[PDB]
Amino acid sequence: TYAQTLQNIPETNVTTLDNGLRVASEESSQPTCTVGVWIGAGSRYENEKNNGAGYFVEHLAFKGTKKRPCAAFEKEVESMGAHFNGYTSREQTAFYIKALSKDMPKVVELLADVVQNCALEESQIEKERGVILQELKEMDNDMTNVTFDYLHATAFQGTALARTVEGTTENIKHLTRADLASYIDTHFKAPRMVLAAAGGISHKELVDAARQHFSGVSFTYKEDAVPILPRCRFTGSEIRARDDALPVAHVALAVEGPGWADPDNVVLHVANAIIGRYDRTFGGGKHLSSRLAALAVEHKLCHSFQTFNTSYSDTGLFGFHFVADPLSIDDMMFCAQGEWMRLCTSTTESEVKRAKNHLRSAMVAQLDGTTPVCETIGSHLLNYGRRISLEEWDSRISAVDARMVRDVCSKYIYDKCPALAAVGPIEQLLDYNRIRSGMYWI
């Protein structure tokens, strides 16, 4: 039974090193694995002058360390068949590796060598600088991310969160060997890091290899304390980047989210599970269960749309995004806001029951392989401070009912001034005022 298969999922071991770093992992009977360090750093932690460093760093994290330069480092990893990947968001950075369990320790070594001893070769920087600069131009043509950036840019205008993860053009043109060095030395620290791993690994063999390469100890009490960030203020507002030269328009709308810790996030997710998502290649077409998707199809309202619940430590963004043609923006938006209102005022048990199953299947698929599991462990600790097992998630999801979905959505959506970002040939979509009024009365 489903119920049992859940209980029988091995536990996630978590032990803390005397230096503050936390080592966690889930052992399976798998010959291959994924281990990595998930860090509590990112553009949010940056400032006006170093915005982008964490990214510039990401660009050098692999170009070799001091103990073993570029050529060697690369050669040593490729030759063992391991995959080295990593990323960086607004409140989270991470470098992880995919290799056979047999090399779990040599991997751990490599990791520690990357986060602790990045080369930062003066000559490499000036090159990755030209590289990042082009990545920006390529990303500038990805309306979907140009939109979410703007969404943040205004939803959290004037604050830390209103900054792009990649950073300013100036910032990247002038950042220095120093600033980068500083960022790493200021942010990459044991208490704010998590060595997570999953596969055919022994927690012990892991934790042991951990104490060995992650030995650096702290003296003062400050070094053991994780700094709390000044919070970000939400603002009902809009930003409209118009360009009738673009073929389609992109729209994103959202209200402020509750933040990782809050339980409501579960219901909020159950909610988005109802509205769900669409994209012209869904074969369900007109029979799809999602009311918005249907209208989208019956009336050719858009090319795609997605609901999201982007969470952060102390805040979040709960809204939706859609791509449409210049002349179907309004109906689309109109219908969309309609569903949000429907959530608040007339959700059905039938709706939620489904939304739940869709959500359950979702959480389970989020752990499909070793990298994804490791990514979940690396995150739960960093955000929830522990691990929430499918067995738990399920119970929290199973407890959600209509009456509940209604109250929450009402609590976060009804009559709230939303943040909106539009890009492209957005002439037909108009007036904040109008959009603001779509925030009440089903």
Partner 1 sequence: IHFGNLARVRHIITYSLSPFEQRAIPNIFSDALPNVWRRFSSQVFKVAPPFLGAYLLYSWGTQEFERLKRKNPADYEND
**Residues acting as catalytic residues:** 58
> Site for partner 1 (CB under 8 A): which residue of 3, 178, 245, 365?
245
Q: Considering the rule CB under 8 A, would residue 440 count as an interface residue with partner 1?
A: no
- Exactly one of 326, 338, 372, 438 binds partner 1 (CB under 8 A); that residue is 326
State the minimum distance, in angstroms, from the CB of residue 421 to partner 1: 10
Q: How far apart are CA 307 and CA 28, in angstroms?
A: 33
d(CA 57, CA 221): 28
Confirm or reject binding of residue 140 to partner 1 (CB under 8 A). Answer: no
Q: How far is CA 394 from CA 7, 369, 381, 389, in A?
A: 11, 20, 19, 8
* Residue recorded with tokens 């860090």: 39
Contacts to partner 1 from residues 46-65, by CB under 8 A: none
Shortest distance (Å) from residue 120 CB to partner 1:
36
Residue from 70, 181, 241, 364 binding partner 1 (CB under 8 A): 241
Q: Does 149 bind partner 1 (CB under 8 A)?
A: no
Alpha-carbon distance 24 to 194, whole Å? 7
Span interacting with partner 1, options 117-125, 237-245, 250-258, 369-377, rule CB under 8 A: 237-245
Q: Which residue has the tokens 């770093």?
A: 21
Nearer residue to partner 1 within complex by CB, 236 or 369: 236
Site for partner 1 contains 141 (CB under 8 A): no
Q: Which of 144, 364, 430, 440 binds partner 1 (CB under 8 A)?
A: 430
Q: Is 428 in the site for partner 1 (CB under 8 A)?
A: yes
Question: x-or-dash pattern for partner 1, window 6-35, by CB under 8 A?
Answer: ------------------------------
CB-based contacts of 251, cutoff 8 Å, min separation 6: 147, 321, 322, 324, 329, 332, 333, 420, 421, 422, 426, 429
The residue range among 95-103, 183-191, 239-247, 336-344 that interacts with partner 1, by the rule CB under 8 A, is 239-247
Sign of the Cα torsion 247, 300, 319, 264 reads negative
Does 228 bind partner 1 (CB under 8 A)? Our answer is no
Question: Taking contact as CB under 8 A, which single stretch among the options 83-91, 192-200, 233-241, 354-362 is the one that binds partner 1?
Answer: 233-241
Q: Is 334 in the site for partner 1 (CB under 8 A)?
A: no
Which residues, at least 6 apart from 115, have a Cβ–Cβ distance to it below 8 Å?
37, 39, 61, 95, 184, 188, 193
Q: Write out the H or E segment, with its range, that includes residue 320.
A: strand 316-324
Q: Point out which span in 63-71, 109-117, 122-130, 243-251 binds partner 1 (CB under 8 A).
A: 243-251
Q: In terms of CB distance, is 199 or 418 closer to partner 1?
A: 418
337 binds partner 1 (CB under 8 A): no
- Give 240 or 291: the residue with its C-beta nearer to partner 1: 240
Of 78, 243, 349, 391, the one binding partner 1 by CB under 8 A: 243
Question: Residues 102, 414, 436, 440: which binds partner 1 (CB under 8 A)?
Answer: 436
For the beta carbon of residue 89, count every other beta carbon within 10 angstroms. 15
The secondary structure of 329-398 as a DSSP string is HHHHHHHHHHHHHHHHHH--HHHHHHHHHHHHHHHHHTTSSHHHHHHHHHHHHHHHSS---HHHHHHHHH
Least distance between partner 1 and beta carbon 438 (Å)? 13
CB 43 within 8 A of CB 163: yes
Place of tokens 């990303």: 139
Q: Pick between residue 80 and residue 239 the one whose CB is nearest to partner 1.
A: 239
The pair of three-digit structure tokens given for residue 191, joined into one six-digit string: 């208490």
DSSP class of 314? S
* Chain residues in the site for partner 1 (CB under 8 A): 154, 235-245, 326-327, 330, 417-418, 427-428, 430, 432-433, 436
